[PDB]
Amino acid sequence: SKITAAPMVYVRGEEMTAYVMDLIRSRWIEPRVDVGGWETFDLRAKNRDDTEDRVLRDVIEAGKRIKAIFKEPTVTPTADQVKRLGLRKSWGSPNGAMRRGWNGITISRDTIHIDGVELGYKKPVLFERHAVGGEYSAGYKNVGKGKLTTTFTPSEGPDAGKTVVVDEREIVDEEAAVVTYHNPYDNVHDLARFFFGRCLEAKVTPYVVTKKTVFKWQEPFWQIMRTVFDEEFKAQFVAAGVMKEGEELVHLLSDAATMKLVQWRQGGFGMAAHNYDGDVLTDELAQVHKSPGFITSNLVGVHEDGTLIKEFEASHGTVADMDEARLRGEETSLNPLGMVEGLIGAMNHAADVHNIDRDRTHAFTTKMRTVIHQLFREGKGTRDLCGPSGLTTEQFIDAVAERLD
Amino acid sequence: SKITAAPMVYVRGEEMTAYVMDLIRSRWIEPRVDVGGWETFDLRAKNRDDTEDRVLRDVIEAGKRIKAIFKEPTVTPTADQVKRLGLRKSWGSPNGAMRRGWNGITISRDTIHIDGVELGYKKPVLFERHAVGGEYSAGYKNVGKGKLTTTFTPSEGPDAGKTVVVDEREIVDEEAAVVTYHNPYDNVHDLARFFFGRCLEAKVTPYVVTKKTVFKWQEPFWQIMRTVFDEEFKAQFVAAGVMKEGEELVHLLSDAATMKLVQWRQGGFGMAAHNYDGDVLTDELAQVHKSPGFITSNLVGVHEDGTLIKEFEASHGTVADMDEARLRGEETSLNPLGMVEGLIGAMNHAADVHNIDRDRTHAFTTKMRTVIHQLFREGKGTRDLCGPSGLTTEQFIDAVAERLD
Numbered sequence: 068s069k070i071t072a073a074p075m076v077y078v079r080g081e082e083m084t085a086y087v088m089d090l091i092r093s094r095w096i097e098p099r100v101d102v103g104g105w106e107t108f109d110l111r112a113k114n115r116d117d118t119e120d121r122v123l124r125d126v127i128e129a130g131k132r133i134k135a136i137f138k139e140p141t142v143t144p145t146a147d148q149v150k151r152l153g154l155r156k157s158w159g160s161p162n163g164a165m166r167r168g169w170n171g172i173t174i175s176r177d178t179i180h181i182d183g184v185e186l187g188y189k190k191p192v193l194f195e196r197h198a199v200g201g202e203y204s205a206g207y208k209n210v211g212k213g214k215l216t217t218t219f220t221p222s223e224g225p226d227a228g229k230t231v232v233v234d235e236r237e238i239v240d241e242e243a244a245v246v247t248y249h250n251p252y253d254n255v256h257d258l259a260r261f262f263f264g265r266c267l268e269a270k271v272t273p274y275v276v277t278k279k280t281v282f283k284w285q286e287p288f289w290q291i292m293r294t295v296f297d298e299e300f301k302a303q304f305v306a307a308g309v310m311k312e313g314e315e316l317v318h319l320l321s322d323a324a325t326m327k328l329v330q331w332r333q334g335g336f337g338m339a340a341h342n343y344d345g346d347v348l349t350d351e352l353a354q355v356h357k358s359p360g361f362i363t364s365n366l367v368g369v370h371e372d373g374t375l376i377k378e379f380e381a382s383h384g385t386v387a388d389m390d391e392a393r394l395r396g397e398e399t400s401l402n403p404l405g406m407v408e409g410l411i412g413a414m415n416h417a418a419d420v421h422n423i424d425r426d427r428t429h430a431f432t433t434k435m436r437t438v439i440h441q442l443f444r445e446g447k448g449t450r451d452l453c454g455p456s457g458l459t460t461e462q463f464i465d466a467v468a469e470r471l472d
Numbered sequence: 473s474k475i476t477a478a479p480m481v482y483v484r485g486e487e488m489t490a491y492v493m494d495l496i497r498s499r500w501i502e503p504r505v506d507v508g509g510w511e512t513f514d515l516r517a518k519n520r521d522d523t524e525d526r527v528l529r530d531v532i533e534a535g536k537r538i539k540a541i542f543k544e545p546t547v548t549p550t551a552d553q554v555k556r557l558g559l560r561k562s563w564g565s566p567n568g569a570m571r572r573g574w575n576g577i578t579i580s581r582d583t584i585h586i587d588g589v590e591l592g593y594k595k596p597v598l599f600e601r602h603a604v605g606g607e608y609s610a611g612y613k614n615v616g617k618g619k620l621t622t623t624f625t626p627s628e629g630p631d632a633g634k635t636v637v638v639d640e641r642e643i644v645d646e647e648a649a650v651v652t653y654h655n656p657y658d659n660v661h662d663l664a665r666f667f668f669g670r671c672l673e674a675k676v677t678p679y680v681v682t683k684k685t686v687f688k689w690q691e692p693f694w695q696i697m698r699t700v701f702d703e704e705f706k707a708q709f710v711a712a713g714v715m716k717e718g719e720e721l722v723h724l725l726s727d728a729a730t731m732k733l734v735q736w737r738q739g740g741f742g743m744a745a746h747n748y749d750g751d752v753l754t755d756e757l758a759q760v761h762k763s764p765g766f767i768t769s770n771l772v773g774v775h776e777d778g779t780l781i782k783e784f785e786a787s788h789g790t791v792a793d794m795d796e797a798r799l800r801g802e803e804t805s806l807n808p809l810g811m812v813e814g815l816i817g818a819m820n821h822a823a824d825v826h827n828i829d830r831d832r833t834h835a836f837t838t839k840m841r842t843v844i845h846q847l848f849r850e851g852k853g854t855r856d857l858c859g860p861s862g863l864t865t866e867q868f869i870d871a872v873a874e875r876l877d
């Protein structure tokens with residue numbers, strides 16, 4: 068009998084990655100797995116516009132109920148796409164909304180390692196991206212000349228109820244952006260614990276990455292991480308052989324960290340950073356390693372009731388350059404491994420949390436990984452790995468299908 | 473006779489780069505050059521503290537008068553360094569202050585190429601970093617729970633004098649950063665002209681880099697760039713064979729652009745970006761190429777009277793990690809070429825704008841460049857280029873000194 072898929076949220080996107088995942092669902096999953104328990108949502112920018120984002124609100128609700136989500140890449144539409152797609156409005160990112168809506172703590176993005184496949188980093192690299200805050204949460208306007216005033220009224224402490232000026236400035240340009248955001252730092256305690264725990268288990272040296280010299284408001288990110296490190300982890304790292312006695316936790320400036328990602332080809336390190344810095348640095352990490360096909364991503368959030376909410380995704384976008392080529396009848400070669408690891412993670416988590424066909428799901432998802440890893444080993448991967456002699460998107464999908472059984 | 477140095481502003485920093493420039497001034501410059509016309513300023517974090525940043529205000533004024541500045545790297549002190557260095561407060565960056573104070577348009581950061589020396593990028597890469605805006609001039613506070621409100625009152629147009637809410641949010645964290653900034657976009661018209669003109673002359677394909685999908689306030693950066701391109705440059709790029717007919721200006725997402733910097737090892741491209749994106753991406757550019765010793769940096773600003781204000785600098789910081797090694801008595805190997813190119817640029821510009829010993833200054837600055845390039849060609853460069861067999865900082869400085877005359 069087909070495997071019974073456990074309840075799981077499936078978020079569909081568009082462009083090349085939706086095309087790829089339709090093939091994978093059709094040729095790898097459905098002949099072996101009954102997916103009736105999946106809740107599938109259409110997060111095409113068009114459908115979001117048609118539903119006034121009710122579909123996004125529904126994904127967020129379902130994630131709370133089900134706790135295991137696979138998220139395909141989605142489009143955050145440009146002004147030019149607003150016209151081409153016939154959207155009544157620009158729409159923001161559905162990723163920020165989900166990350167916020169699930170009380171996101173960390174987006175973990177780690178390098179993939181396959182026995183016998185030489186990649187950019189020799190040993191595992193771990194990345195913890197702060198899942199919320201920063202410019203992803205910003206209010207803004209595009210304006211001309213005028214007065215911009217920011218105030219804060221605390222609700223606790225000796226100055227409760229009194230308003231202070233955070234900033235006031237005259238805009239003297241006919242064209243300017245004015246932007247306000249916050250960084251919520253309470254859950255950076257949780258992030259630090261999670262990050263240092265994983266680094267300890269993988270035996271990699273941790274680094275904290277910020278621009279706190281100039282972006283001085285970021286100081287608590289560093290201070291919280293250092294305090295958690297010193298009080299809960301420093302001794303464990305020394306005892307495990309990962310760091311030496313008297314070796315302090317190291318801070319890197321975000322610009323310098325881009326240099327460390329190129330330089331540190333041995334791997335064997337971890338970085339934690341704010342939301343946007345993590346976005347930039349994890350794409351860089353992907354390309355140094357090989358491509359975004361060789362990175363895993365997952366979000367850890369928390370339900371109001373305290374149970375974890377786990378979303379799994381590729382690190383990358385919808386691969387619009389290959390989509391253009393696809394629609395013109397030209398060859399493409401999208402590496403599905405990143406996305407597939409996400410779907411594996413989500414399916415395994417779903418089966419464990421909801422106690423449905425656990426053994427068989429784990430064996431099947433392990434099999435998908437194995438087959439993919441073996442094709443890569445045999446030089447029958449996609450072109451990101453193998454160069455021009457690699458297989459096309461469709462060739463690779465079929466090669467996996469033949470070996471699954 | 474020693475060469476007469478033209479009036480020029482010289483900004484000294486601290487740590488390793490100040491140590492190196494002290495040696496270079498002593499051993500390369502002063503034996504051949506009378507530096508009496510230089511106006512030198514001490515921007516040690518301690519001296520900024522001792523003078524309440526009067527020294528920084530003096531630099532900015534002198535820059536306006538003299539229009540040719542060499543800026544060594546400086547320390548923007550951390551909270552931790554405030555204590556160690558005995559500072560009354562955590563001073564901001566001198567760089568942001570100078571960039572604003574000189575009506576900064578562009579920070580041009582370009583790859584260095586030396587005949588016969590294999591580096592990361594085969595052909596020239598050009599970067600235009602918007603010199604002002606963004607989080608570099610943010611107002612901010614670190615706060616607890618309360619109400620954050622941002623308002624804007626336009627001074628022109630039909631709603632002049634009426635106040636609108638830009639943003640309002642409740643902070644629910646005990647520890648949060650609240651931040652307001654602006655991006656001034658009027659001078660992006662000038663940046664676009666300077667960028668496309670430079671790319672046209674170098675015959676490189678230009679790209680614009682932003683996060684305008686999610687950071688939607690950035691749209692005008694792209695639109696301004698694209699309009700200037702379409703109206704003033706596209707036809708010229710086609711005519712010069714740099715782009716084909718019907719080929720549009722390409723936009724890249726900032727996170728994706730980090731991948732393009734690793735992948736595009738052929739070089740022969742240009743990127744333009746906002747202030748912070750430029751900071752991050754130009755450090756990455758440096759490391760992919762070889763190190764920060766193989767990048768040039770200069771700031772183009774504009775005096776109230778319309779005259780160019782040109783500041784020259786290395787792309788990098790004070791190289792604190794080598795300074796710590798130096799002070800423990802360990803070997804170092806700082807590549808001075810980045811900084812030296814800045815000093816060259818500033819000396820030449822000074823001689824030209826103030827009409828003092830031009831031929832001889834140009835010959836001597838060319839000689840410094842030639843001697844450095846030749847040592848690199850001979851495998852007698854610093855360890856960033858040559859590996860462990862390369863010269864120490866001091867060996868390299870002495871090697872150049874011996875060949876100067």
Ligand SMILES: NC(=O)c1ccc[n+]([C@@H]2O[C@H](COP(=O)([O-])OP(=O)(O)OC[C@H]3O[C@@H](n4cnc5c(N)ncnc54)[C@H](O)[C@@H]3O)[C@@H](O)[C@H]2O)c1
Binds near residue numbers: 360381728731
């Ligand atoms: N998490 C997300 O949902 C997410 C992330 C990034 C971008 N996007 C969206 O995706 C679209 C495209 O953005 P983009 O072009 O900047 O980013 P992208 O990650 O789709 O592509 C960037 C580059 O990497 C390559 N690439 C990415 N994944 C690959 C894979 N698995 N195999 C081989 N090559 C791969 C692409 O061909 C392209 O050259 C946009 O609409 C953007 O809003 C979404």
Ligand SMILES: NC(=O)c1ccc[n+]([C@@H]2O[C@H](COP(=O)([O-])OP(=O)(O)OC[C@H]3O[C@@H](n4cnc5c(N)ncnc54)[C@H](O)[C@@H]3O)[C@@H](O)[C@H]2O)c1
Binds near residue numbers: 319320323786788791
């Ligand atoms: N323009 C500036 O004034 C500027 C820029 C960046 C950092 N800083 C300041 O510099 C200090 C150090 O910051 P950082 O360590 O993040 O940056 P950094 O640029 O000093 O060093 C970053 C890394 O690059 C290496 N490196 C840099 N320049 C080099 C060269 N010429 N040759 C060989 N290796 C080189 C360093 O050894 C280090 O590993 C901080 O106090 C910071 O505020 C100043």
